[model samples]
Target: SNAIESRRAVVRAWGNQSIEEADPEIHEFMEKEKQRQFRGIELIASENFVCRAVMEALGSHLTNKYSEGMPGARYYTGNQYIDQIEILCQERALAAFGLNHEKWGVNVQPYSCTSANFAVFTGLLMPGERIMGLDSPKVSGASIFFESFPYKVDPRTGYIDYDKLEEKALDYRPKILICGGSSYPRDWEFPRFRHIADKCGAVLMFDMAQISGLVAAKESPNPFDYCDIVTSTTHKSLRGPRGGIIFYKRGLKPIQYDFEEKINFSVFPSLQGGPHNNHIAALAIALKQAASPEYKLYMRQVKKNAKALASALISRKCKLITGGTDNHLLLWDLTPLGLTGKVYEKVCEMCHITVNKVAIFSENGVISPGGVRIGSPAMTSRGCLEPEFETMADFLYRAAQIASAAKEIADLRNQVEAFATQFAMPAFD
Candidate 1:
C-alpha cells in the first residue's frame, strides 16, 4: 500500500520501489552472498557479523549528509543534525571502552584502519624519522614516510620477545613505536612497550584493529590508559560497518596542541574530505551493542571457542603457531602435513569452512608460507560454542587428510550446511 498513492497526508511520504525491481543484478548478488553467509562456516579471524541495528543505520538517510569537518564546525551548512549524530557517535565510541571524554578525544572520520594509520603517519613524524613496528609489512604507511625499523617474533615460540624488542628499541631509539598485527593471536605487551617508547623517546601508537571488541568487553587488556595514540577498525572485532577510529590522550601541554589536535587536522583536510556519516551512525549503534552485557558474554565465548578449536586441531596432531591462542584466532603450520596454506585454504572452502592464507615467519625469512589462520568470532556470532568448534576441528583434520577426495569433501560440505542451519545467526533486532 503506497501511502502517497492513498488518500492521507501520511500517503504523501513513501514509495513501493523494491531493490529487485531497481537493480536485479545487485540484488541477486546480495541474495547469493546472504545465502553463502547463512550456510558457510565463516572462520576468517578478522571477520564478524554486525548486529541488525548496524546494518539499518548503514542504509539510513544519514548517508545523504555532507559534513566536511568536525561536529559544529563544518565547511558546509545544513549540518546541525549531522553534527549531533557525529557527536553522539564520538561519545559512544568513548563510552564503548569505558574511556573518559575529557581525557581522550576520538576521531571517527578515518575511512579504514589503513587510512587511520596513514593519518597518524602524516600527523606525528617528519620524513626520515625512525618508526618501529612489528616485522610484518602491513604497516607500510609509516615505512613510506619514515625510516621503518621492525622487531621480529621468536621463531621457536611464535611469540614476540619482549626483552629483544626492548633492546632494539633502546638501540635504535626510533621516533615512534607501533604495536599490533592482523594475524598474531597473543596480547600486546603494552606496559613493556610504554617503557620502551619512554626510554627511546618515541611516541607510542597502539593498533588494536583486530581485537577491539575484546577490549571493549574488557576480555582483553586495555592499552588506552597508557599509549599516546591508538587506532582500530570498527568492523573486525567491533562488529560494525567497515570504518576506522582513532583515540588519543591530550597531553599535559595543552597550549602546544599535542597528538589529539595533530591527528584531527591530519584526518580532516590532510587525509579526507567529508566523513562517511552512515559509517559513523552504524558504528554508534555498534558501540551501543559493544557496551551491553550480551556482548561481554559473547566476547568471553569467542575466546573459549577459539581455545576449543585450537585444542581440537592439536588433539588431531595439527601444528599451531604459539602452541595455543589467547584471543580469537590461531595460525596452523601446514608444512608438517606437506601442504601449503593456499592449498589448505582452497580445501577448507570445498568443505564449507573458510580461512585465510597468511605469511609464516621464520628466523631467516620464512619460505613457501605454509600457514593458515582461522578464528571463531564469526561462528560464535552465529551462536557457535566449544562443541561446534570441536566438530570443526575434526572437519579440518579430515579435510587435510583427504583434501584430494572431491566426493568425501562434498559429503562433508553437506554436513557443514546441515550443522549451520541448526545454529543460524541470532536476530539482533
Candidate 2:
C-alpha cells in the first residue's frame, strides 16, 4: 500500500529547480494565465483539459531522449526505454478504441492532426490523385495537395445527403473519399461510406479528430470497422497531449501494398524528424485513462451535457446549425438575433465565457460570420455535468440576447466566476 501510494505521488518538474529564480516575469504571467483558466468557462469545442498524469508525462524525462525510428529498429542508440514507451503508447492507442491488435496498426508519432493528415496522404496517394473531402466552411485543414472535389451538408436540412455524396464520388472518380470535419456535428454512416468508396474505387479515410473520444467511449460508430484508414488528434475528445495518431487495417488482401510500412516511412522520412517522445508517453497515459470505465462515464456525461445545452439554447429560440447536435458541440446561428458570431463571442468573453466564432454555410455573407460554436468537453473535463451545462447554456443565451452591451455581462460575469471557480484547475488529480 505504501509503495502504491508512493508511485501515485510522483511529480514531474524539470529544466530549472525554481521558475521564480530563473524567470520571474514568465512565472508571473503563467500565474496570471492560470488564474484566468481557473475563473473562466471554456466552451471551445476543439479544446480540452488534460489530466495531471498526462501533464506529468508531458513534462517528464522522456523529452530528453530522441528515438528517430520505430521501436526495435532505430537510427539512434540508448533507446531501450524510449522504445518501451512508444510500444506501450502504440498498444494503448488500439486498446483505447477496442481495436484488435492483430488486425489493426497505429502510428503514434505525428505532431498533430494537421501534420498527421499529411503523412496519411503521402503514404497512401500519388502526387495528383483526386481527394473528395467535406466542403463545410468550418472543416479543419481540409485543403490538400491534389485535385479536390468537396461535398456539403444540405442547406435546408443541415445534414449530409448520402445519395448526393455517392453520386458525386461516382462522377468524380476520386482516389480518396474523406469523412468527418471540425464543425459538422453528427454521426456518420460508416457502412454507407464503405459502399461508396468501393463503388468509386477510392480509399475511405475518416478524420476522427472531432469525434474520436465518442467513438472510443462507444457513443458513436467506430470507423475502423469500415474505413481503410483513420486519423485523429489525441487532444480534442481523446483527452491526451496535443498530438496525432493514424489507424489503419493491416494484412488485408483487399488492399494492395503494406499499409504499415507506408505509414511509418511517411511519418519519419517524408514528413517529420525525431518524434516527440514526451507526447508519445503522455498519449500512453491518456489511452490508459480512456480504457477505464471512468472515462466512459465521463464521455457519456459530455454527451448528456451537450444535449442539455442544446435544448436550453433552443428553448430561447436560438437557431442551431443542423437543428441540434449529436456530439459534444452545437453550432448556433446568431442571425436570428441580428448579431454576428464576433459580436456574440465578444459578449460571451465579457461574461467570462469562451466560445468560437465559426463559419457556417448560411452565415457566409455576414462580415464576421453569424455562427458561434460551443462545446461541453472543456467544462465537462472540469467535472461540470448536465445541470451545470444547462446553466451555462442559459448564460450563453442571455449573453447573446445582450450582445456587445458591456454592462449586462457584469452580473452574468460574476455568476460565471462563482460557478466556474467551484471546479479547481488540475481537475484530474
Candidate 3:
C-alpha cells in the first residue's frame, strides 16, 4: 500500500508541477521576454497585446483535449464541451464581423493565416493552376506548388498600380486574384480588384490580416463586399490570441463555388488534423471584446495615432511611402538619409524601440530593404493617444538622426524605457 501511494505521488507531481518547478530555464527565458516587452516600445505592424482574460483562456486546460473535426462532428469521443466552445467561437467570429449566417461561414481552426490561405487554394483550385497575389512565395507555396504571378506597387508613388495590376491580371488570368499585403500602407482598392477578377474570371481573395481590427470596427473598407473569400490573422489589429480565421461566402447568388464543404475538407483532412481548442476559446473571448463599444474607441484612437505619427515624422523631414498612411502602419523610406533599413532598425532596437524592416519599391533586393514599417496598434493598445504618438514620433526622429550621425543610443534607450514603463502593458499584472 505504501509503494502504491509513492507511485500515485509521483504521478501527481508530474501532472501538477508549475512551470517554475518543471523547467526553470525556460521559465527564466519567458520572464526575460516579458521584461523585454515591458521595457521596449513595440512598433511592429503585425503585433498586438491580448487581454488578461484571453491569455488566461489560452493557458487553460482546454489544450489537453483534441477535437479533430468541426463542432458536433468530431473524430474523437468526449468532446461535448469542446463542441460547445467551438460552436460559440464560430458564432462570435461571424457576429464580430456582422456577417449573416446564411451568407457567410467561418472556420476558426487554422493555425495561422498562411494555412488558411493554402486551404483556400487547395479547396478552390487544382495543383499547378494559377494564383496571383502581392507576393510571398515561401509563405504561401503559391509559386512552388501552383503557378503564381505577383503584381507590384508603382515605384514612383509607392502605391499599388491598379492599372498595371489590371493589365497583368487580364493577361495572366489566374484562377485566384489576391488583394491585401503585409507592408502596404494605403487602403486596398477592392472595387478595382473585383472588376479585374470579373474580367479575368477569377475568384477574388483578400488577405486582410493586417487590418482586420480596423475593418471590424468599421474604420476600414469591408473586403466581404467585393471578395469571394477573406482570410485574416487574429493577432494583429484584432488584438486577439495568435491564430487565423477564414470567412467564405455561402448560398447561391452571384457565383456558386461550393466553398463551404471544399474549404472545410481541405482545412481538416488535407491541411491540419486537430483544432487548438484553447486558442479557439481564447479567440472567442477576443471576438467578444472586439464587438464592444470600447473596441471601436480603441480602433479610432489607433488611426488617430497613426496620423499623428505620420505628421510628426513629416515635420522632421522623413520620407514616408505614399506620402502618409490611411491605416495603422506607415513605411519610412531611408534612402534620403543614405541609410538601409537594417542599419536604422538596429539603431532603434538599441534605443529600446521595436520596429520591422520592410521592402519599399526603391530598394533593389529583399536582403536589405530601404524602409522601416511602424504602426500605432500596439502602443495604442498600451493606452497611447495622439499626443503620446507624437512624442513617439520625436523618439523615432531622434533615433533616425542618431543613426545618420553614428551617435550613442544609450541615452535615448533610458528615455524610451522610462516613457514606455509609465504606460501599463495590457494583460500584465
If scored against the real structure, what TM-score would every candidate get? Answer: 0.93, 0.92, 0.95
Tens digit of per-residue lDDT, candidate 3, span 3-72: 9999999999898999999999999999999999999899998888988999899999999998898888
| Each candidate: RMSD | 3.3, 5.5, 2.1
User: Candidate 2, residues 342-419: lDDT per residue as tens digits?
Assistant: 888887888888898987767343232788898989988888988899899888878876874426568999999999
Which regions of candidate 3 are displaced past 4 Å?
A: 1-8, 136-140, 363-368
Candidate number with greatest lDDT: 3
Question: Where is model 2 more than 4 Å wrong at Cα?
Answer: 1-15, 138-144, 254-257, 363-368, 404-406, 427-429
Ranking of all candidate structures by their lDDT, best first: 3, 2, 1
Which 10 consecutive positions of candidate 2 have the poorest summed lDDT? 135-144
lDDT of 3 at 105: 90
lDDT (Cα) of model 3: 0.89
lDDT of candidate 1 at residue 32, scale 0 to 100 = 86
Please report how far candidate 2 places residue 372 from its true position, in Å.
0.6
